[PDB]
């Protein structure tokens, strides 16, 4: 139900499983009997926290009848978030 | 074969007062209803217009025929302005703003023309 995602500096991010499965890389790491924890030695705290925020944003607003808001990305994290997203396939 | 002589200046002055009222007309929203009708699209832009609309004319050509005395009376001028408006109406059909703009430009023409100070 809930899976743990550790950053490179040790921060623990607990999210729903259906939320973390938004990432393709995380989906392979999980259940590959099945796994509940994933560690990333090359993604910092300020990136995973924003990554996990996207998981909440994707699952809530996918197939929604609401007004979809913009996902905000500050300039100072855009690069690191880009390869984080490229690495996680989400 | 004296078709060379120009229209009397009072007649040309009259036609240009009417066609300027029509072209400069703005609705209560400040919008120039005549702008889309100043110049026709090219045959390569909109071939469907020339397939269907068969005697094409724009305000550019209408106000041209005033300079060169092609219209010999205010009625000759009205015949093209009505043909311009009916061309837009049969191509775009009711329910379109261009149709309803041409409804109004017809009304402005007959108000502007019915101003005869004579």
């Amino acid at each position: 139900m809930y899976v743990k995602l550790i950053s490179s500096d040790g921060h623990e991010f607990i999210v729903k499983r259906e939320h973390a499965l938004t990432s393709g890389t995380i989906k392979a790491m999980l259940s590959g009997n099945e796994t509940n924890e994933v560690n990333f030695r090359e993604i910092p705290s300020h990136v995973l926290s924003k990554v996990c925020m996207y998981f909440t944003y994707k699952v809530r607003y996918t197939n929604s009848s609401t007004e979809i808001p913009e996902f905000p990305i500050a300039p100072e994290i855009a690069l690191e978030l880009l390869m984080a997203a490229n690495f996680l396939d989400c | 074969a004296e078709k060379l002589s120009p229209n009397p200046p009072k007649l040309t002055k009259q036609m240009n007062a009417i066609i300027d009222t029509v072209i400069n007309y703005k609705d209560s929203s400040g919008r120039q209803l005549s702008e889309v009708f100043i110049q026709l699209p090219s045959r390569k832009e909109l071939p469907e217009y020339y397939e269907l609309i068969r005697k094409p004319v724009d305000f550019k050509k209408i106000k041209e025929r005033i300079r060169n005395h092609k219209y010999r009376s205010l009625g000759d001028l009205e015949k093209d302005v009505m043909l311009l408006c009916h061309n837009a109406q049969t191509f775009n059909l009711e329910g379109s703003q261009i149709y309803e703009d041409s409804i109004v430009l017809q009304s402005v023409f007959k108000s502007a023309r019915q101003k005869i100070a004579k």
């Binding site: 990554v51 944003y57 607003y61 913009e70 880009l82 390869m83 989400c90 | 469907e48 329910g95 703003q97």
Partner: protein, 146 residues
């Protein structure tokens, strides 16, 4: 005659374009030859009653970046014939972009394409930034779907 095109059906249809997104929306009408025609833009939160015709394809992009947007949760919009006197509503919203695409959008908005290759990222991402969103690429994919 392309498969994604408007049909020259002279059947009027009233449509309400409603930009329910934070973006400046560029409506793109598909020609009778399937060629994209840009139409006047819509500020965020703005709506307009639009006259169109039955069987005409519509498409909606970000006016500044050409990012793809959604209309009634789909990518394409075709107005039916109006039932009685009732306009067809086109709700234009953002899509749920991938995390990678949203990042590309923001990096594209800050890094001018000259300095794409000056960014110290995996070189497979340089080419991702260069894959700018446009209408023809979407028409290609959306066509081959059918």
């Amino acid at each position: 005659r392309p498969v994604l095109r408007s049909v020259n059906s002279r059947e009027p249809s009233q449509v309400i374009f409603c930009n329910r997104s934070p973006r400046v929306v560029l409506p793109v009408w598909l020609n009778f030859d399937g060629e994209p025609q840009p139409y006047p833009t819509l500020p965020p939160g703005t709506g307009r009653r639009i006259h169109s015709y039955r069987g005409h394809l519509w498409l909606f992009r970000d006016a500044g970046t050409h990012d793809g947007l959604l209309v009634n949760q789909t990518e394409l919009f075709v107005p039916s014939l109006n039932v009685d006197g009732q306009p067809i509503f086109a709700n234009i919203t953002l899509p749920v972009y991938t995390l990678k695409e949203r990042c590309l959008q923001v990096v594209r908005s800050l890094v001018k394409p000259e300095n794409y290759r000056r960014l110290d990222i995996v070189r497979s991402l340089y080419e991702d930034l260069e894959d700018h969103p446009n209408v023809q690429k979407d028409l290609e994919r959306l066509t081959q779907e059918r």
